[PDB]
């Protein structure tokens, strides 16, 4: 659910334990990555997420309601240089993500800041709640 195509192996720069700003008006400040769903288990490799990936994260900062809980999160910014199909390499300002249910429905009424094109084209609901795509 939520996905709209097959994964594209973009550069990974968000291994487990990373922290990223919550780019939504849901009230959460940051998201702590605990695991990367859909990733491969390599020998000693830390599961690494990327733009457009769905991962499980816990709200380490924000209102107490979201604290200590775990919910699926979608990465909207990676900040790591990766090769887009349109020739030029690009990287975002900083790491960011959003919190949504496994069905792709965003908890926040609207997303803030730039949104990766790959994630927008793979998560239609994210693009629906996005205002600045790239």
């Amino acid at each position: 659910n939520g996905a709209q195509g097959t994964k594209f192996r973009i550069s990974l720069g968000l291994p487990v334990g990373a922290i990223m700003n919550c780019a939504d008006n849901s009230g959460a400040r940051n998201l702590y990555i605990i695991a990367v769903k859909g990733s491969g288990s390599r020998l000693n490799r830390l599961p690494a997420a990327s733009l457009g990936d769905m991962v499980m994260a816990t709200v380490k900062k924000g209102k107490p309601e979201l604290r200590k809980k775990v919910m699926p999160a979608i990465v909207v910014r990676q900040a790591k240089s990766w090769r887009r199909r349109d020739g030029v390499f690009l990287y975002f300002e900083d790491n960011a993500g959003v919190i949504a249910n496994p069905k792709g429905e965003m908890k926040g009424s609207a997303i803030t800041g730039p949104v990766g094109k790959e994630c927008a084209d793979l998560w239609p609901r994210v693009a629906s709640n996005s205002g600045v795509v790239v």
Partner: peptide, 9 residues
């Protein structure tokens, strides 16, 4: 393919 009718490097 998702990149149909698209330019690719």
């Amino acid at each position: 393919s998702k990149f149909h009718k698209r330019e690719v490097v």
